[PDB]
Amino acid sequence: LFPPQWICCDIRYLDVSILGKFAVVMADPPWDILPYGTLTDDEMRRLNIPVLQDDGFLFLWVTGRAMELGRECLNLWGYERVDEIIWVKTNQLQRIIGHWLNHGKEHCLVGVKGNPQGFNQGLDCDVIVAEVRSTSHKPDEIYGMIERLSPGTRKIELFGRPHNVQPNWITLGNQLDGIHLLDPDVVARFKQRYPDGIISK
Template identity: 80%
Template sequence: KTNQLQRIIRTGRTGHWLNHGKEHCLVGMKGNPPNLNRGLDCDVIVAEVRATSHKPDEIYGIIERLSPGTRKIELFGRPHNVQPNWITLGNQLDGIRLVDPELISSFQKRYPDGNCMTPGKNP
């Protein structure tokens, strides 16, 4: 992605040869999840570079195994990030995308007209 030699010449910084090829994944949890499985998966995923913000498919399985049976939300998601059993939020999604039947039913009961973005409407 980057000409590393040019970066060193311009910035004088060394030791950043692989920064362009890695990303961090932050996982936050609310409350005390009953089934938190630590140490099941490796901390590193080696995968092909994909389109911008296109995560490796393996990350979703790792997070599912970390906390099975819990609700999951992805912030700043794009259409290619939508996953079953996840709520995906992002300004590049056209409307609301829910895949899980239970979430769809709950959403339709709470917002019959499908509009959850009206100010003051959320209880």
């Protein structure tokens, strides 16, 4: 099912095995480094990311000490970090907008798992330049980069907010509206695993 889909839930407790395999996973975790709902480092280590892919890529936003922690989780989950995207934050004039240096950028680790095949490696470059939207928002160019890399494939975002829903993407987050699912096999395995629409233990 090509158009957006999402699942309001707690990503800690949802049974992601019902969702199937994805060519791309993306995650903007709420690392404990609290203004929103944070997750401890063991909770992050424990997320069942390994079930979501057999071959493909993981995009993992990091800041501060998660830069090292996210490298850990990425290896723990079975990936090799093969690239790193930085987003240079500008204004509308395209000038540039951590107690030692002011931070003009945000980092996104790129991990590979297995032997992904038929992707378009090399189409983009590891630098995004784009204006800041709201606080805490990734730039939208990341989805265009990801689509050029793996066109038409199943992609899943972890810890999205409603502004993150995207065609070809399934967005999981705890501030989304309900459960909107259109992929048949997913609607199936969801009804089988949750015959009553509550995600609990």
